[PDB]
Design a protein around this ligand. Sequence first.
Ligand SMILES: [Mg+2]
Ligand SMILES: [Zn+2]
Ligand SMILES: [Zn+2]
Lengths: 529, 50, 1344
Amino acid sequence: SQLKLLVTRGKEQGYLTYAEVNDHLDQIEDIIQMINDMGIQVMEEDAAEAAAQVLSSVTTDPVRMYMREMGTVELLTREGEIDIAKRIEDGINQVQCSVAEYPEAITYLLEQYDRVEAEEARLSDLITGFVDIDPELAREKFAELRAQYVVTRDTIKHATAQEEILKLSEVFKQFRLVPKQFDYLVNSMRVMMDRVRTQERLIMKLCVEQCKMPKKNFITLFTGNETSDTWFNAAIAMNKPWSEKLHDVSEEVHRALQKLQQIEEETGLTIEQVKDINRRMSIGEAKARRAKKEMVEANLRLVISIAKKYTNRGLQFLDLIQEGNIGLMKAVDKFEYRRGYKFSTYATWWIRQAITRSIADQARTIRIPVHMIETINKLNRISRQMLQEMGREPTPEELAERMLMPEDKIRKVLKIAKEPISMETPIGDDEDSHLGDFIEDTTLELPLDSATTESLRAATHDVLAGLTAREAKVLRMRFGIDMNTDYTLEEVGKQFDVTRERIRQIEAKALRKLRHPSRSEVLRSFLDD
Amino acid sequence: RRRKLPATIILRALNYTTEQILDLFFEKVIFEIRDNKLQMELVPERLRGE
Amino acid sequence: EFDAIKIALASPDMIRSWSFGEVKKPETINYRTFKPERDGLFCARIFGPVKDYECLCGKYKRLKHRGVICEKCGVEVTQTKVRRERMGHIELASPTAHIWFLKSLPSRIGLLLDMPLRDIERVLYFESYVVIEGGMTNLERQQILTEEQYLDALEEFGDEFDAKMGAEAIQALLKSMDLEQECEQLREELNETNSETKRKKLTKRIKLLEAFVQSGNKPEWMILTVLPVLPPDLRPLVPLDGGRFATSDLNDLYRRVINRNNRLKRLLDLAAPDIIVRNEKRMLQEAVDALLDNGRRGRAITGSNKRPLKSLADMIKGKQGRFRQNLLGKRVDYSGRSVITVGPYLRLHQCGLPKKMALELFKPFIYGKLELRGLATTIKAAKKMVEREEAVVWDILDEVIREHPVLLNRAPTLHRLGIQAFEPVLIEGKAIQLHPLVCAAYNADFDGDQMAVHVPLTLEAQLEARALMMSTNNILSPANGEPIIVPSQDVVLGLYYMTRDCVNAKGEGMVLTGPKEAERLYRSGLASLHARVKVRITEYEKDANGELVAKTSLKDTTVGRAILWMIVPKGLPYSIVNQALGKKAISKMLNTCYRILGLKPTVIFADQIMYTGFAYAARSGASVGIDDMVIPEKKHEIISEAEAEVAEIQEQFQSGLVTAGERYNKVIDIWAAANDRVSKAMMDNLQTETVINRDGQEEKQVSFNSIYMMADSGARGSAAQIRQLAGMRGLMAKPDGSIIETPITANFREGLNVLQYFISTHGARKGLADTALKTANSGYLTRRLVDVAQDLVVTEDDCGTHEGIMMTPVIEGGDVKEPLRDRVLGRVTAEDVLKPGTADILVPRNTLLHEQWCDLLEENSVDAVKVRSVVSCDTDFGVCAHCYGRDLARGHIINKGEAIGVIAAQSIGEPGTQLTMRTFHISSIQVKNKGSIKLSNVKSVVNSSGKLVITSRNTELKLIDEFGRTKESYKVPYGAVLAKGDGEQVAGGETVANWDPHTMPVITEVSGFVRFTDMIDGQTITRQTDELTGLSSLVVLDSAERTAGGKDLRPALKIVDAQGNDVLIPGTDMPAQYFLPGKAIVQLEDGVQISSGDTLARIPQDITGGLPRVADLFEARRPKEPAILAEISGIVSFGKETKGKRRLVITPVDGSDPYEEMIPKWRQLNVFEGERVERGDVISDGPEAPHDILRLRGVHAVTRYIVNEVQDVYRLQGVKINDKHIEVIVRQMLRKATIVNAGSSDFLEGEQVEYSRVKIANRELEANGKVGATYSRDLLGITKASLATESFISAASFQETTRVLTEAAVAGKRDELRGLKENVIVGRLIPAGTGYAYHQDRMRRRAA
Ligand SMILES: [Mg+2]
Ligand SMILES: [Zn+2]
Ligand SMILES: [Zn+2]
């Protein structure tokens, strides 16, 4: 009963300073704030049992928690990093072969290649170069995959076809196409399996997961034939009571066979080929991704070092680090040891631009262009070596001759900086009046000026009372009076049915009668020169 | 402002022991075996009002 | 028009219903133009247009496009004020936890899920999983894991775990759990575990869950997935002159949270490593948590300013926040300030005004008049011409101000008399005039103090100010009926100089035809202003039924008093101006004028007394001269004697006879005695030094020294400071309380050398330092009184009950510290008042005791008046008007509507300033005068001397007079030597009781012999023989004195006879053997004889007054030495021994005594284990707690203890305050209560609820055939009674805002506007005052 004793002491004495709470036991700050409201009135020189129970249970600074997270992280070895890199490469090669394991993947490849041969893109933008100068080689090489395919079409009738679809894949592996074309068939390959797997959710889940169908009966039926009705539409003579329940969906999951034969057609070959193709892909792919995840772990020590110097330019320290990580992971996709290098020197390029491209983006309440922040950081630095050099200070004219800019393109940037003041700033007087307590309004109608205008629509109503029905109505017509209004002069020509020209005559007649001194002197009151 | 310690902990950390510490901080009342009923030396003003 | 304000948790679909779009970007504005960004924290489309009736792209810029939202810029063109009204929402990338249900003290999400808060903390910040659908492997929903355990559960099965970590985990926890299931479960798991902790804990938690149930609120609503943003306007981005800007911290906080949300979104589409994304989620939880509030989170995450960023909740709570500061205390239009000066010429019903301020505040009025007159054309011309200030506007202003009152007001408005309304009087100059008889009501001098004037705009406002608030209607203080327009500082000096006999002056001893000839003779220079004179006068002593019967005489008096009589009205008798007429007497004069002759004559007479007093103090030429500060000729003598004394003590101290710590005290007492001697000498030499000789010989009169004349008059200062002028000036204690032994033997008429001044500086510095600190809490106890009893108003007219208190004077054996007059003036008798002739019904049932009935009782001497307090008023939600009484500023019965809670607060508060701010601290009943004696509770017998001696306990003496009253009472302890009996018309100066602190005897009831029982030596006691002379005796020994071989025995000198029995005490079933506790000093050895009432064994054995003694006293705080008493009324007896504390039980007459608890013997027993003590009888020690007074002696005692406790703090100070107010705070102190049995109720039996629900419930259930239910009366300190509140807006405004809100949020509370603190917030009328009609008729509207 240590802290239980100290809280007993708090209920005894009723005020406990840092001496006890430091010597009766960060978590220090946390526990003092908790002991505040037994209530105890702690100081520095349903809660009593509630706070007692929370003080009976024995840091959350996310920086401390982040160090503790990183505790099981350690610098990775150089050629070990090469090993992780080659593992990533093996994963990307698994994914490449997987897409080349899909023949119609290469078919859509030829589709895009023809569209760029029909000029639907750029001959150097169809791919990020082959793994080898002039496109007619790589293009004819793509054309080789064209002919290398139609030589493959002769042989699904299977011994000579399987190693012919791959020869256009082994050539495929020696290429490097742009990721958008890469991810399209991939994200179509991602679409391919969701379509087929969803079918078995219509195929199998509507048998194995509803009709009390044991796992053996579908797997012992489906996988082995896997395409026709011999595995599904033959199960309804299983001598079973649940295979008897295979009738109500027999025309429905047979549709799911109508969708699979589409998918076998859509895949061009058996779905189990396509299955272990993209199964193999994401099998290595996750491992491939797993390889990248491993490497990013052992480089955050760089990023905490990088961000150690950008900190106090108005950005939260855990905000610098997260932007730091974003570059560190983006480079894992881009760093290549294929030259033979250390990732350490490569990373800080990306991680520097990460912090700084962000620091100029989301580090003020008024945002500014990086090319303007390009300017301000160029002045403030060039301000240094001129203030330190010339003597007193760089006048904006003096900056005009260091930087030959017009000095009214400069001086506007020197008006740009100095982000707004905290309106909760405490003003003097020791009165606790904040700054915002004196910033007045400009939207308010001056209470007198409202009081004025209420007579205006009254007073103009006065003279407009003693008008003719035409002039009184036409002026309310002509001007924006007592309605959603201001109908144009042609518009008043229509409603009053007189003339676009005649209206201005009576309109001219209108105030010409109202231009009488000693007749409309009321609005003469609303004049002050 | 840190955790409290028994004060002579620093002194034991200060290369000190029982004898010379209790010498430095108190006086010396010497009992002896003078063969008969523990004959004791005393200072007359050392033992005033009591 | 709305009503019944509501609050509850907010659904995500609710929050989507509020917004007009969702912010996405963290941009705010365009840095080149200042137009809002696309969908930043200031949007065009989202929060609407920027200026009046235009889009932002400029496509449409007319009012005729109203409503249509543009197509390029898409901003809905409407008023620009709409940016103040719209709200934006945010779709968080992932869930995150609301701080208020997370880190608040009772942990609203803590006890909603059985968890410790640190467990859910480890869950939230991505530390350890929490299991949900955790299979039938090891867990189901609660217990936490680790990554070793997370992977060894993911080990051996991937299925069957289904757990997450952080926000989503808690969200699935709440979204899965049902309420009804858990409530019924722990219901069954409750009544089988209703152990004393378990019962209350589980019952309260199931109460919370059922409150969640009936609310329709969903727990997963607590965790946030959509976050709503303020409108832009309330967090503006104002432009500052000079290119800079100013924003509120809400802006950048929103910006940072949007940045973290965008980052987590980018992370999620990357499928980056879970470490980085988990840090992102943690960071966003951090950001939102610091957004909603800054305190629970560790570090208030500051900005480039070295100050903490100021988040949302900080804009509601605190002093600075909206509630406490800006929502009640707000500036005002048509109000101005100035410096106040006196201008004594003008009457009490008005105040001077500067002309410039008068023309400013009433500007719109003067515009309206100049347009009504046609002296201008339009308002613009009117403003232009008043700015020119032509002649006509002055007459217009003199016309409009004419009957139009203005409010005056000072900075420290303590009581309601700090704001009074006056009629303006246009004055040139720029000061504010003031009737000097109103400064004291304000408590403002003229050292440059500044009032403020507000204008009552509304015609109901003008009438409110004139009929309720105008100064002439408000002359009598509210804290006590004393008139508070008394002559303050200088008119009293003039009046005292006017009414002052001197033995010989001009025209001594003539006869005057009237007062008028007195005035004519004085101003002509033929008699002196004050010469003793025979004068003929006529006094209108109205005696018949409103009949002013005049009757003249030849009064012998001063010319001055005769003059002053001409301003006294018809009512009073001449014996009021026929004295010296100091400061006290003249206040009494105004009091009697009000009491006799109404109000208007008293106000007119007040202005007259001020006018004449000022004029004659002008005539007096009363100066102060250096010759007038007389030094006594025998001062240096006393100084030499005292210096001889200090030398003498020093000589002895060198002689070794004294301690320095007593040499100090001896020299202090020496100098103090010398100080009082010097003061008496100087008073004799100054108070009456004036000798005068009419007809030869000289005669003695009071002095005419015009410092004495300003102390004896009581105008300013007293005898003590005049001592400080001439005589020696104190001893000048150090700051703490250590007095410096070498006094300041100088005075101020002589100088003070540097060390005398330096010694003065200690006390001067401390005093000034602590008088500048009663300013720091001028209104702290006033605040904490108002915020508990503000919601209490007189509501009905009479509740027809009979309870109340029996009023009796506050006398403690001296003189009557408070007569029955004051304690009963203005209250309502609950029954008749029967003369001691036992047939004289004097006031039947509802006679408001004004001065006349209380007078009649005064000369009739009945002191038993059962008066209906407020605290026992049967009314609901308020108090019977007839119960409260009459003590208004107006002398009449209270009228329904009056916010007596607030005036009670301001009366118990504002004299608190007049108290001392710091808690300072401070044997035989000898009959002091003539009379008889009455022993109340006199349970005694003819004792050993054949006389009376206290065998009882609470025998209270009384100086019985033959009037029918109690003249002077005393307390008589146990076994007191009553040298007489009860009912003896005795003489004066007699000690009729005696007793010894070292002899608290156990004297015998009846006779017997000294025949012991169990008194065994070596086993129980020691055979003591005090052989200085050789007497042996068996004194009782305590258990540490008794051995273990006799500790399970009970020593006693057994009462016996000469035969062999143990003579049993008649009345009990026990034989008499006086069991004795430890230290029981015994003498009579075995076998000795005694008789009835003999000395068997006679065992041996400051009031504060500060202000914070009162706030504590209004808190029922358990003092250090509580005194517990008997819960049962009957014969008591001991029990177990020393389980840390002794044991003993109070046995009933017939029932059971299961009552026993840890009675520590460090707190000494005053009763043995053989007395028939009743419930509420003194057994424990020290100061009784006020709680036990309630639970044992009832509510009336706990209030009579508390008013008679806090009143004497005022009483000990010389301050006066009525008792009515100290009850109305009491009545709030005991509003809550606890239950005795459900019966026909709807609550827990061992539960707590306010009185009125019970009070309406089980009084109604008697109307039904169902049973009534019983309840225990709780009692809460004011700040603890104040939190318990039916509202949730009256609580947010003063207490911990977050604590109230989350509780009232989860509770789904609904406040229907009542009380006075809420209707101010909403800005409708108040239920209490003039707006009592406006709020009842809502009930008729709320009655259909
Ligand atoms: Mg003052
Ligand atoms: Zn538009
Ligand atoms: Zn009442």
